[PDB]
Amino acid sequence: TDKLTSLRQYTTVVADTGDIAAMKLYQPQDATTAPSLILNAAQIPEYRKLIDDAVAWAKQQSNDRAQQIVDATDKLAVNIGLEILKLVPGRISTEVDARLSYDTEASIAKAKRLIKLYNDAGISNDRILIKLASTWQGIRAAEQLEKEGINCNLTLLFSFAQARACAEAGVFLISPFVGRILDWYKANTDKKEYAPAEDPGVVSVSEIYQYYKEHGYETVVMGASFRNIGEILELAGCDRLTIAPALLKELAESEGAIERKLSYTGEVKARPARITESEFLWQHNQDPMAVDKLAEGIRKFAIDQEKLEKMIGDLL
Amino acid sequence: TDKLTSLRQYTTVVADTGDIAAMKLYQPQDATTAPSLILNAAQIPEYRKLIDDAVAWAKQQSNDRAQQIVDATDKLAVNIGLEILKLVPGRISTEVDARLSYDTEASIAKAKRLIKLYNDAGISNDRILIKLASTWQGIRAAEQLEKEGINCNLTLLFSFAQARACAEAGVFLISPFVGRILDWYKANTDKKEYAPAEDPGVVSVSEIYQYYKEHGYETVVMGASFRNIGEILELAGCDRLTIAPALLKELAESEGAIERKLSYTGEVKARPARITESEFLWQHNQDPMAVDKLAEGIRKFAIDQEKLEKMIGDLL
Numbered sequence: 001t002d003k004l005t006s007l008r009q010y011t012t013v014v015a016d017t018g019d020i021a022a023m024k025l026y027q028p029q030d031a032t033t034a035p036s037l038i039l040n041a042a043q044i045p046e047y048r049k050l051i052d053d054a055v056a057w058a059k060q061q062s063n064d065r066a067q068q069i070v071d072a073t074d075k076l077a078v079n080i081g082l083e084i085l086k087l088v089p090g091r092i093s094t095e096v097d098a099r100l101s102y103d104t105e106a107s108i109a110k111a112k113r114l115i116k117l118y119n120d121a122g123i124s125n126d127r128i129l130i131k132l133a134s135t136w137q138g139i140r141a142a143e144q145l146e147k148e149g150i151n152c153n154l155t156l157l158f159s160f161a162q163a164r165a166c167a168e169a170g171v172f173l174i175s176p177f178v179g180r181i182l183d184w185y186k187a188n189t190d191k192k193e194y195a196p197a198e199d200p201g202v203v204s205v206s207e208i209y210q211y212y213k214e215h216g217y218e219t220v221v222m223g224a225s226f227r228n229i230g231e232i233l234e235l236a237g238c239d240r241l242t243i244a245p246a247l248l249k250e251l252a253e254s255e256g257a258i259e260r261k262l263s264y265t266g267e268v269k270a271r272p273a274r275i276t277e278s279e280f281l282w283q284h285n286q287d288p289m290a291v292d293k294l295a296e297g298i299r300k301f302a303i304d305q306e307k308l309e310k311m312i313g314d315l316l
Numbered sequence: 317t318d319k320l321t322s323l324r325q326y327t328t329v330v331a332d333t334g335d336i337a338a339m340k341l342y343q344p345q346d347a348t349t350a351p352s353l354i355l356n357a358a359q360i361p362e363y364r365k366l367i368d369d370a371v372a373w374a375k376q377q378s379n380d381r382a383q384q385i386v387d388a389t390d391k392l393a394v395n396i397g398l399e400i401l402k403l404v405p406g407r408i409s410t411e412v413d414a415r416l417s418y419d420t421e422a423s424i425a426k427a428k429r430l431i432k433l434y435n436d437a438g439i440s441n442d443r444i445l446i447k448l449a450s451t452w453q454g455i456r457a458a459e460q461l462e463k464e465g466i467n468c469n470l471t472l473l474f475s476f477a478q479a480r481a482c483a484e485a486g487v488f489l490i491s492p493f494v495g496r497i498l499d500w501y502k503a504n505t506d507k508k509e510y511a512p513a514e515d516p517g518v519v520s521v522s523e524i525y526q527y528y529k530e531h532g533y534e535t536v537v538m539g540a541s542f543r544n545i546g547e548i549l550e551l552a553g554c555d556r557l558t559i560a561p562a563l564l565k566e567l568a569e570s571e572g573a574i575e576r577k578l579s580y581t582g583e584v585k586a587r588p589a590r591i592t593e594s595e596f597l598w599q600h601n602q603d604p605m606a607v608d609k610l611a612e613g614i615r616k617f618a619i620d621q622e623k624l625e626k627m628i629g630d631l632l
Contacts, residue, residue, distance in 0.1 A: 102597035137594070278453070281418035285611040292608060295601040 003229070003258055004251040007236055010260045014090075014242035016224060018080050019044060022245040023087035026252070030090035032153070032175075032224070032242045034131070035098060035304035038077050042311060050079040055315050065316060072312045073305075078117040085127055093153045094118075095131035098301035107132055107141040115150055129153040129173060133298050134162045136280055143169035155224070156297040159290035161275070161283035163208040166219060168274045173220035175242070176205050178235070179227040180297070184289045196230035200289075205235055206262060213264035215271050229254070237262030319545070319574055320567040323552055326576045330406075330558035332540060334396050335360060338561040339403035342568070346406035348469070348491075348540070348558045350447070351414060351620035354393050358627060366395040371631050381632060388628045389621075394433040401443055409469045410434075411447035414617035423448055423457040431466055445469040445489060449614050450478045452596055459485035471540070472613040475606035477591065477599035479524040482535060484590045489536035491558070492521050494551070495543040496613070500605045512546035516605075521551055522578060529580035531587050545570070553578030 004026070007013065015028035018041030023031060033041075041047055054075035058068045081092040094114055100106040111130040118128055130145065131153040132138040139162075142152040151172035157163060158181060166174045178201030185200045186192050196202060205223045212221055222240040226232055229250050232241060237260040243251075275283075285291055320342070323329065331344035334357030339347060349357075357363055370391035374384045397408040410430055416422040427446040434444055446461065447469040448454040455478075458468040467488035473479060474497060482490045494517030501516045502508050512518060521539045528537055538556040542548055545566050548557060553576040559567075591599075601607055 099598070102601070103594040106594075135597075137597075278419040278422075281451075281453075282415070285418070286615065288608075288612070291611045292604075295607045296604070299602065299604075 001255070001257060002252050003233070003254040003256065004248065006257045007232070007241075007251065010237045011235075012240040013248075014222065014240050015088075015248065016242040016244050017041075018084070019245065020083050020087055022248065023084060026245075026248050028088060028090075028248075030092070030129075030240070030242070031084045031088050032093040032129075032131070033077070033080065033084075034095050034155075035301045035308065038080060039304050039308050039311075041080055042076070042308065047080070050083065051076060051312075051315065054079055055312065059316070068316055069309050069313055072316070073309050074114060074117060076308075076312070078114065078121065081118065081128075082121055082123070085123065091127055091129050091151075093129040093131045095155070095301070097305055098133060098298050099305060101133040101135050101298045101302075102137050104137045104141045104144075107138060108144055111141070111145055111150060111152075112148075125149055125151065131155050131175075133294070133301070134158075134166060134174070135294065135298070136165070136277055139165050139169050139171070142166075142171045146170055146172065153222075156294055157208075158204075158293045159284045159287040160204075160207065160211075161280050161287070162290070162294075163211065164275055165280050167212055167215070167217040171219055173222055173240075174208075175222050175224045176201075176208060177225040177293070177297070178202060178205055178223050178231050179225040180293050181289060182227055182231070184293055188288075196234040199231055199234065202231050202234045205238065209238060209262050210264060214266065214269055216268040217271075233258050234261055236260050317571070317573060318568050319549070319570040319572065320564065322573045323548070323557075323567065326553045327551075328556040329564075330538065330556050331404075331564065332558040332560050333357075334400070335561065336399050336403055338564065339400060342561075342564050344404060344406075344564075346408070346445075346556070346558070347400045347404050348409040348445075348447070349393070349396065349400075350411050350471075351617045351624065354396060355620050355624050355627075357396055358392070358624065363396070366399065367392060367628075367631065370395055371628065375632070384632055385625050385629055388632070389625050390430060390433060392624075392628070394430065394437065397434065397444075398437055398439070401439065407443055407445050407467075409445040409447045411471070411617070413621055414449060414614050415621060417449040417451050417614045417618075418453050420453045420457045420460075423454060424460055427457070427461055427466060427468075428464075441465055441467065447471050447491075449610070449617070450474075450482060450490070451610065451614070452481070452593055455481050455485050455487070458482075458487045462486055462488065469538075472610055473524075474520075474609045475600045475603040476520075476523065476527075477596050477603070478606070478610075479527065480591055481596050483528055483531070483533040487535055489538055489556075490524075491538050491540045492517075492524060493541040493609070493613070494518060494521055494539050494547050495541040496609055497605060498543055498547070500609055504604075512550040515547055515550065518547050518550045521554065525554060525578050526580060530582065530585055532584040549574050550577055552576050 013028050014030040018033045018037040054072045058072035096110045134154045134157045154166045154171050155175040157176040181201035220239045224242045329344045330346040334349045334353040370388045374388035412426045450470045450473045470482045471491040473492040497517035536555045540558045
């Protein structure tokens with residue numbers, strides 16, 4: 001059989017894209033989106049109906065142009081989520097405005113607002129994951145949201161400190177970025193080529209997976225952002241993996257069964273005391289890669305958000 | 317006359333070193349030290365008396381080896397400060413353990429402890445500046461310390477967000493790191509050479525100086541960490557400048573008067589509302605250079621601290 005079919009025996013496959021064409025092709029359980037993917041999806045011709053629909057709905061909700069752009073942008077993200085949920089049995093991840101990454105209160109409010117839009121469309125919370133950046137503020141926001149029945153996807157996770165804080169907050173799922181970790185080492189270290197087993201991103205996710213299962217944490221571990229199928233195969237066994245369509249295609253066109261790589265067969269160990277903010281900050285900042293990548297990822301998503309509001313603005 | 321003598325007309329000269337030999341040579345008003353400089357100074361033969369003295373004093377204060385290393389390390393820093401105060405009419409800056417940079421409570425406690433040691437030696441607070449890293453936690457610590465009569469030197473300042481928060485907290489002085497800003501651009505940008513007037517570090521300090529005088533803030537602006545005399549000359553007029561002995565020597569051996577570069581001749585403007593933590597975090601992290609350099613500076617100072625404790629340990 002093909003690699004994709006073989007991977008499904010050990011890992012839940014998730015599609016990382018806002019394009020429904022991929023859902024039909026690979027039949028993933030869940031789908032993940034992001035500001036960047038929403039922006040690209042907005043270019044898709046058949047998605048024009050979703051945009052006009054969002055704009056029309058916005059104008060019917062208020063007469064203030066400022067508020068219309070926000071309602072339009074949020075409604076578009078939800079409309080795309082709605083089309084995807086018609087093709088996948090699992091969940092859709094929709095990301096909150098990245099400009100709110102360091103504001104717990106604003107992030108909680110935005111998350112509830114997005115949930116409100118999905119609920120108004122008749123979709124229950126069990127089909128959704130609110131995606132937020134794994135800053136200390138985002139983690140604190142998610143801890144609160146989970147208690148209120150809103151499941152979260154903690155993304156842009158790079159340091160072990162972030163992984164630990166997320167597990168301790170009891171979030172539903174985390175999204176460590178394998179590929180971007182590789183990018184940092186390629187650009188800041190002497191070594192420019194890595195064997196799958198030595199790929200820094202792979203090593204990072206493997207360690208997080210071990211720490212999570214070893215302590216009985218229920219948080220789902222979903223590796224994301226890949227650079228090659230090598231990283232994916234080396235993580236076979238991870239709870240879930242969200243993969244871009246291009247890599248999904250490569251796996252499906254590859255023959256040969258693969259073997260499970262990630263597993264924890266021991267007994268559960270006792271959990272330590274919770275990490276405090278001060279300890280979190282010290283440990284996260286001890287990681288040069290994580291320091292750079294977390295801040296950068298937030299900057300980029302914020303820009304994608306602004307570009308999307310721009311596009312929507314010229315339609316009001 | 318020489319450049320050094322000429323600079324003194326516009327700017328207060330401060331020596332950046334723990335070596336008293338420099339104090340006698342350049343007669344600076346103040347002197348600044350740091351973990352790294354304390355470590356190097358510990359190598360100076362004539363400083364052996366200061367080390368043994370610190371160790372002896374520590375053993376007389378407690379019988380616990382753990383506490384002795386801490387008392388010894390702190391007492392050494394203070395002993396060096398004491399030798400320097402005999403040669404300078406101004407203040408000495410002594411830095412708190414960098415491992416406490418993200419802990420407000422612990423930083424306040426450490427600062428008071430160092431102040432206690434200076435007071436026990438008969439030195440009043442007006443001759444001292446407690447040096448802390450300009451993280452949000454360090455700024456909050458300094459705001460509190462200033463209210464209690466303890467003046468602070470907010471160092472490792474890189475972003476405008478840090479500069480603004482420091483002024484709003486009413487700290488006595490800030491130490492923006494000119495040279496390290498240049499290092500970042502040389503290593504992460506295409507351009508590897510800069511004219512003094514276009515040096516990123518120089519531009520950064522000039523903008524901070526303008527913002528401070530423009531709004532009537534009393535916080536002293538002291539540029540630090542230089543790479544060449546060009547950066548120094550381009551900042552003539554800055555309240556103070558702390559310079560390494562090697563650059564102090566270059567200025568003294570250079571002939572030719574210099575002209576004032578930094579000045580604010582307008583009227584004071586109204587101050588805006590205070591920046592909040594969320595806004596601070598967003599703005600600081602918008603600066604790739606500041607993100608990298610702040611975290612890095614803290615990591616290095618922490619290591620210097622550990623090395624110093626090592627050295628002291630092998631003497632107990």
